[PDB]
């Protein structure tokens, strides 16, 4: 069941297996960087609808910060105009500036706050996160009008 | 001589006008530090070249 987990760039699909074997790796007694974290990099949903175990709290925020500056500050410097409308931009666009690991780990965290609906406050955070994983998948759904207006 | 000069040395220093401890009130760009002398009032006054 390790090989179906090999190809890890998915925005969704690889999620739960990286939740399942990881909680299975968490019930395996590994709460730190382990098989569990390798799943957490590759969980783009670990517990989104479900409640996260000690799995999310430790293993996300370990690379959830390793994700942070991975995507964030790539865009302070550039030769072209500011802003992009592409959902396929993880800030791995163009040359790779970002680990999809970090990305999809955050692209769990991106769903993790996709359910949260922290839109208005998270802006400047998500600006100081500057995660172009986040805000596209941070709201893919729910209400676009007022949620994203005070964005 | 260690002493001798050194001993002698102090005599120099043993001759002082004084060194006013003073209360710097502030400076300006003038490089005259604006200073209240402790008993006296303020005097905006140049500094030591090293300070």
């Amino acid at each position: 069941l390790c090989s179906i987990y090999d190809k890890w760039t998915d925005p969704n699909l690889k999620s739960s297996l990286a939740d399942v074997l990881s909680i299975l790796a968490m019930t395996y007694s590994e709460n730190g960087k382990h098989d569990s974290l390798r799943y957490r990099l590759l969980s783009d949903v670990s517990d989104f609808e479900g409640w996260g175990h000690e799995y999310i709290r430790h293993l996300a925020l370990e690379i959830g910060e390793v994700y942070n500056d991975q995507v964030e500050k790539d865009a302070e410097d550039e030769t072209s105009s500011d802003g992009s409308k592409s959902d396929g931009s993880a800030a791995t666009s163009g040359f790779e500036f970002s680990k999809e690991d970090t990305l999809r780990l955050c692209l769990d965290i991106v769903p993790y706050f996709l359910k949260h609906n922290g839109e208005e406050d998270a802006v400047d955070l998500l600006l100081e996160i500057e995660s172009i994983d986040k805000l596209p998948q941070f709201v893919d759904e729910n209400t676009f009008q007022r949620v994203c207006q005070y964005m | 001589n260690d002493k001798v000069r050194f001993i002698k040395d102090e005599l120099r220093l043993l001759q002082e006008p004084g060194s006013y401890v003073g209360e710097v009130i502030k400076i300006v760009s003038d490089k005259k530090v604006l200073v209240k002398v402790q008993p006296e009032g303020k005097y905006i006054v140049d500094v030591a070249k090293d300070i």
């Binding site: - | 005259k32 303020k42 905006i44 006054v45 140049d46």
Partner: protein
């Protein structure tokens, strides 16, 4: 370059030279000065800068020679005025203060209303809810230059500053017009005592009286107004009151349950809570608190819910927090 152009102007002076106070500027382009060491000499500027830039009785550029005035010396020791909170269309408006409207109309009708009559008001009652918040309210509602001064700030034991300090205030009041005249906490320059002699401070009255001389020296159609904020009613001249000029004594009292509720509804909601916390829940258990223990109930509630280790405060914490603070 200009360095030396300026520096020569310095090279004039010689140095270090003497910070020293003026006594009397005299048109001879001499003037008599004042030394903390008390040589006091009738002596001349070195003129590029201006006598006008300074006042008789001010610390000025002086040589060590005769203490010849070298030129303009600050004497930055104070601000442009005595001790002031200088505000214009100030932060506090009648909305921000909770319902004070009882005496808001007092400050409204006196100051706000005529601006299209008496020259101002007397604040009394409690600070931090009534007086300070009212102070800026119509000052903001007239949107003029609000000058906040405490009698303790002004509590000048030097003879003539207290007036000059007030004059420095009146200096702003005239030029910075429209200027809201606010006067805080006069227990000291305002107690006329029993006498002009024998240990009673004239600079008390002399501050006030000239402050009053300048107070009684203006009345308006509603443009410039005055405010008197303090707890001592009778230590003050009736001419300081001068019924017909300040007929408004604004004496704050603990905000009544609804006016409380406004300060509550303001300051309850502005400290996080659980909807268990409610206004009439907090209204009722009160003794008629000041607008502060409104806040203070709400403030500590965070800390007591922080003592519960929660940012969303329970209804008990407020009830605790009030019955604490």
């Amino acid at each position: 370059k200009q360095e030396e152009e300026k520096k020569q102007l310095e090279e004039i002076r010689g140095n270090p030279l003497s910070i020293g106070t003026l006594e009397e500027i005299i048109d001879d382009d001499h003037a008599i000065v004042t030394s903390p060491t008390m040589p006091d000499y009738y002596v001349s500027i070195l003129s590029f800068v201006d006598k006008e830039l300074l006042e008789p009785g001010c610390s000025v550029l002086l040589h060590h020679k005769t203490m010849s005035i070298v030129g303009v010396l600050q004497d930055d020791a104070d601000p442009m005025v005595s001790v002031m909170k200088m505000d214009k269309s100030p932060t506090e408006s009648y909305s921000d203060i909770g319902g004070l409207e009882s005496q808001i109309q007092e400050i409204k009708e006196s100051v706000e209303l005529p601006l299209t009559p008496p020259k101002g008001v007397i604040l009394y009652g409690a600070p931090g809810t009534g007086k300070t918040l009212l102070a800026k309210a119509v000052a903001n509602q007239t949107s003029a230059t609000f000058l906040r001064i405490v009698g303790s700030e002004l509590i000048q034991k030097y003879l003539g500053d207290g007036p000059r300090l007030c004059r420095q205030i009146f200096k702003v009041a005239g030029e910075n017009a429209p200027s809201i005249v606010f006067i805080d906490e006069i227990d000291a320059i305002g107690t006329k005592r029993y006498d002009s002699n024998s240990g009673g401070e004239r600079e008390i009255q002399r501050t006030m009286l000239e402050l009053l001389n300048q107070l009684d020296g203006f009345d308006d159609r509603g443009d410039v107004k005055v405010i008197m904020a303090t707890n001592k009613i009778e230590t003050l001249d009736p001419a300081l009151i001068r019924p017909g000029r300040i007929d408004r004594k604004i004496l704050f009292e603990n905000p009544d349950l609804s006016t409380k509720k406004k300060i509550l509804g303001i300051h309850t909601s502005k400290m996080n809570l659980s909807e268990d916390v409610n206004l009439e829940t907090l209204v009722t258990t009160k003794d008629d608190l000041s607008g502060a223990d409104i806040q203070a109930m709400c403030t500590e509630a965070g800390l007591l819910a922080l003592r519960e280790r929660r940012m969303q405060v329970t209804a008990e914490d407020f009830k605790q927090a009030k019955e604490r603070v």
